[PDB]
Amino acid sequence: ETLNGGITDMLTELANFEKNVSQAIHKYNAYRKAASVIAKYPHKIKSGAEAKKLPGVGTKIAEKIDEFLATGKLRKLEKIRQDDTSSSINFLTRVSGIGPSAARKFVDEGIKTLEDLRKNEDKLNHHQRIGLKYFGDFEKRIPREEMLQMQDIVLNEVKKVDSEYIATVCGSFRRGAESSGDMDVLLTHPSFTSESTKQPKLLHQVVEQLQKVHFITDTLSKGETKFMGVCQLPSKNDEKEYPHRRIDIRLIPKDQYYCGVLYFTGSDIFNKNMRAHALEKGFTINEYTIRPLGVTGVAGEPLPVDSEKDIFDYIQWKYREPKDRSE
DNA sequence: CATTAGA
DNA sequence: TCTAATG
Ligand SMILES: [Mn+2]
Ligand SMILES: [Mn+2]
């Protein structure tokens, strides 16, 4: 957690680089498993060979550890850290819609900067076009104060269109959190569930409503169950306008909401931890259901959930307020 | 780990 | 269709 900090940190720097700049999935995958185990190691790794003893650690990585242990730096790390090309990929990538793939391609063509990005807006698809348009705002964190306003609006329309609609703003926001990165609204309705063959409109309707009133500004991607967009709070009695916010709305068949919801609320740890328990407690939990574990090894049969309660109950846990889903 | 765009 | 990208 800190005894091996630098070693894992470097390892990650390296890993990340292969995966992006180069196309070294293997090497890349190599660095992480490596970084993964040394992290778990209970003792200050004093040397190559020492780490070396570990699974995942080969000759190449050890060697790196040696140099870094020896001197407070890594050359190869130093070389990349400097290099404009790799530098450029790291950058372009920030644009919503630009993955490494395209990052590299652009680079190749010579699009390195944000300006260059503009002068060739044509080279970019809508998503990436929007990404660029909202580049500053896309980087800015969302104040709960703002999150509170947002959520207010959504909930209002949703209901206006259909009273039968169930919506949940999940994530960090849900979990109390001071700021959040983008809004995630979980959505479900009674006339939609596991079997009931769709009702795309179910998604569509609201998407519209939101737009209609100007909450939704742009569309990043929209399908019959998941829409990805951009939103914004009505700029008051002028002198101050609101940054553009990433927002994602998803349709869920009523019969999987809470698992769904439960889930998204996290925290990643809480999840796992919750999930680990369900296992002893004779169950299985995953993004949509929870099924009783059969002794033969495995077993199926989705239990019936009406609230985040039912689930706790199931694995007979303490119902944990989202506030404290922290771990 | 899955859903949407794209070309 | 595959491949990319966000989550
Ligand atoms: Mn979020
Ligand atoms: Mn999101």
Side-chain angles (χ1 to χ4, degrees), chain A residues 147 170-172 180-184:
Chain A
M147 284 289 256
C170 300
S172 18
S180 322
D182 55 2
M183 152 155 306
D184 270 271

Side-chain angles (χ1 to χ4, degrees), chain A residues 54 58 105 137 144 165 180 196 201 240 248 262 284 305:
Chain A
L54 266 35
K105 145 214 159 195
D137 295 13
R144 188 158 226 268
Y165 271 122
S180 322
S196 74
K201 262 342 148 181
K240 69 263 280 284
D248 304 357
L262 177 47
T284 187
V305 189

Side-chain angles (χ1 to χ4, degrees), chain A residues 181-185 226 228 246-250 264:
Chain A
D182 55 2
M183 152 155 306
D184 270 271
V185 186
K226 170 177 192 207
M228 253 144 72
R246 278 294 302 88
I247 176 196
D248 304 357
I249 325 168
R250 45 226 305 177
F264 275 114

Side-chain angles (χ1 to χ4, degrees), chain A residues 4-270:
Chain A
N4 300 137
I7 296 157
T8 61
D9 299 345
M10 167 225 226
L11 260 28
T12 44
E13 279 226 15
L14 262 343
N16 268 325
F17 159 95
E18 301 283 0
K19 133 71 154 213
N20 289 171
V21 168
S22 21
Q23 174 164 128
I25 168 69
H26 289 316
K27 274 187 200 175
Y28 150 84
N29 223 166
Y31 279 126
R32 59 154 330 160
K33 99 312 194 202
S36 182
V37 326
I38 95 152
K40 292 188 167 181
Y41 189 73
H43 313 295
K44 250 222 164 53
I45 293 183
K46 250 53 201 273
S47 43
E50 195 201 323
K52 197 173 161 157
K53 309 183 157 318
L54 266 35
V57 333
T59 142
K60 275 161 286 94
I61 280 157
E63 180 151 7
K64 271 151 269 220
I65 310 185
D66 279 315
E67 174 191 5
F68 172 85
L69 268 13
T71 111
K73 272 261 220 152
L74 193 62
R75 147 139 176 187
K76 203 185 160 169
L77 222 39
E78 72 160 33
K79 150 156 201 175
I80 286 170
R81 197 287 130 162
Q82 283 156 198
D83 191 41
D84 101 273
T85 276
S86 90
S87 263
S88 306
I89 299 170
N90 297 101
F91 188 92
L92 260 12
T93 252
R94 286 159 51 191
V95 176
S96 201
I98 293 197
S101 164
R104 317 178 220 162
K105 145 214 159 195
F106 280 123
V107 185
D108 330 82
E109 291 170 312
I111 329 321
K112 306 202 166 128
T113 107
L114 207 160
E115 301 228 42
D116 305 345
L117 265 182
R118 309 159 158 134
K119 334 299 303 166
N120 321 242
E121 198 190 336
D122 65 305
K123 291 210 158 64
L124 339 177
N125 67 255
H126 191 44
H127 185 158
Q128 340 197 98
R129 297 220 175 119
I130 288 193
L132 171 57
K133 179 146 158 252
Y134 303 138
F135 195 102
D137 295 13
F138 277 8
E139 278 192 332
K140 307 218 205 86
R141 291 289 312 194
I142 314 165
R144 188 158 226 268
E145 15 266 287
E146 297 196 346
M147 284 289 256
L148 285 191
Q149 40 191 130
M150 283 194 279
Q151 136 178 291
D152 185 54
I153 333 211
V154 184
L155 289 181
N156 293 345
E157 304 306 302
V158 174
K159 176 178 160 145
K160 38 220 291 259
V161 19
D162 204 2
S163 191
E164 232 66 38
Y165 271 122
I166 303 189
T168 300
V169 184
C170 300
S172 18
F173 164 71
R174 190 122 176 294
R175 283 176 308 175
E178 276 304 299
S179 79
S180 322
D182 55 2
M183 152 155 306
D184 270 271
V185 186
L186 249 323
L187 190 56
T188 191
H189 177 263
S191 78
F192 183 53
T193 149
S194 275
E195 317 87 27
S196 74
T197 198
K198 310 271 184 202
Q199 208 191 24
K201 262 342 148 181
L202 270 189
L203 178 48
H204 296 235
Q205 265 170 172
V206 319
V207 177
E208 226 139 43
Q209 184 44 224
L210 285 35
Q211 259 142 324
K212 171 187 172 186
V213 321
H214 321 309
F215 182 67
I216 297 179
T217 51
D218 323 86
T219 286
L220 237 30
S221 82
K222 184 199 341 227
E224 57 197 346
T225 56
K226 170 177 192 207
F227 148 99
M228 253 144 72
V230 179
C231 58
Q232 209 204 14
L233 306 159
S235 310
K236 311 277 179 177
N237 22 170
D238 278 3
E239 276 292 2
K240 69 263 280 284
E241 167 163 313
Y242 281 107
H244 284 81
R245 288 106 175 31
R246 278 294 302 88
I247 176 196
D248 304 357
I249 325 168
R250 45 226 305 177
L251 201 33
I252 296 304
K254 164 103 196 287
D255 83 306
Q256 3 193 242
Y257 205 46
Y258 316 95
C259 284
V261 144
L262 177 47
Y263 177 53
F264 275 114
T265 325
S267 54
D268 282 336
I269 66 294
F270 174 37

Side-chain angles (χ1 to χ4, degrees), chain A residues 273-285 290-294 303 311-318:
Chain A
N273 274 105
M274 158 127 58
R275 301 178 153 194
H277 180 83
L279 239 322
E280 302 337 299
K281 299 315 162 110
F283 298 113
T284 187
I285 344 272
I290 192 218
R291 306 153 315 164
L293 230 13
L303 276 20
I311 287 146
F312 282 95
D313 290 353
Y314 276 12
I315 57 168
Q316 58 214 141
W317 230 18
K318 66 146 149 176

